[PDB]
Amino acid sequence: NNKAETKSYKMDDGKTVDIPKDPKRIAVVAPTYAGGLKKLGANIVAVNQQVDQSKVLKDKFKGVTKIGDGDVEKVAKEKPDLIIVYSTDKDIKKYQKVAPTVVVDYNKHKYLEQQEMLGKIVGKEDKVKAWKKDWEETTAKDGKEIKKAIGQDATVSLFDEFDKKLYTYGDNWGRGGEVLYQAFGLKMQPEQQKLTAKAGWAEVKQEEIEKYAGDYIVSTSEGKPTPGYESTNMWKNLKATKEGHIVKVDAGTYWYNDPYTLDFMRKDLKEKLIKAAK
Template identity: 70%
Template sequence: MKKLLFSIIALVLVLAACGNKSENDTDNKKEETKSYTLDSGKKIDIPKKPKRIAVVAPTYAGGIKYLGGNIVAVNEQVDSSKILKDKFKGVEKIGENDVEKVAKTKPDLIVVYSNDKNIKKYKKIAPTVAYDYGKHKYLDQQQELGKLLGKEDKVKEWKDKWKAQTEKDGKEIKDKIGEDATVSIFDEFDKKLYTYGPNWGRGGEVMYQAFGLKAPEKLTELVKKEGWAEVKQEKLADYAGDYIVSTSEGKSEPGYKKTDLWKHLPAVQNDRVIEVKAETYWYNDPYTLEFMRKDLKEKFLNLNS
């Protein structure tokens, strides 16, 4: 009878200990995580201080790196940018479908685009934050990354300095080219000609938002829905500004530059075309923005007015 009583008491103590451990584990988990609202409106738990981040969506790599995030895997596309390539030396490079490769880096947080077809697979590896690229303007985008990493103060500090500096830069540029001068962005991809608005890379954020330069009205209307649009070569003159930024630096001459329409544009005839490197101008993180700010300012100020 005594043996049975001791056994019952021992069992009760073990169960109580297990219960306390379970409660402690739950409490610890709550202390280590925080709720984060995705672009979809859904809330998920993510680490308060992520230690190993996999960035499948390259747009956010530079911004996370700037805020001190420890990136253990990053999309290989960052190596196309001469600015970002040096920032990710030694970091595991992944393609957009390298789910197993991501898993091997043992991330505690994964960042992807909202249209990534592998989201469900990534969720099985670690908490996964999916961003809708078109939803956030570039400054808002960096603020979101600040919330993600708990670095809102650092983002505010950067943002205040950036606004103050680019306001001065924009004034200098407009004093040179004219307050009402218009600027267009042209980019050839897969033998098609495209133009971009104020929030789709290629320098648009810096020129139109930060510097406050103007796009031609017809171009603004054309890109209003998607943020970018294809331009038929025969319509080139309709969307060409007083100044043109062409993403053909370092490339063989694109097809649209071989046409008579291009050669007769006022911007071309007056030597008001700025050449930039497409792959470096794809992004809008703080590192790339600072490069573009200096690069564009210098090139605008050195053009014929």
């Protein structure tokens, strides 16, 4: 063995950290980047346990040593050549001591750009550029098909029901949106589209609901205390309801923007809608 050569990396803040050229023992305490790196085929020794909430990533990370957040003690025991942490991480310095680490500012990285962002790290810059081009092509054609199925101008809304309250997503690039809107090209509800978030997806009031509901709805229910079957307050009259155009999806899966969860969402969404479209 010979100490493998380095590459200097500019981070989201400090513009200097030295990292492995081909890291062979990466520990991520930042689950956002987990699936992204695995698709790139790099070796992951340690992954944040939170990934066990994604029916997709739970399965992609079987048996892999799972870390809590801030569990610096337990991580070093795997002696990782490279460590990845969110910028908002507590032990940012303590990890720099365990191994060379990169702080990633979650908020400076969206869906495809952040897969490039990860691409820039393990030098597999073209493994992503390639895959990216593939996705860009497929989802788009899928859109064409789903657009035929449900209507060329059908609006699709995206709703969560937490603790008996309803919430619609603001950001057209997360929690499904990336695929629905930015990949497939399905139309947004004009009012939902107006939402500023950039902010925790906002509660919809009992009255302004027809205003925010799409022709179809991709409805999840992480109001995990869960009181029952979505209720039916004013939810009774909705075009989507009335026509059976609500489609359910696992909340915790639809968190992650990593190529695995992404490619899953493509399948999951496309299927569920066209089926929902009678």
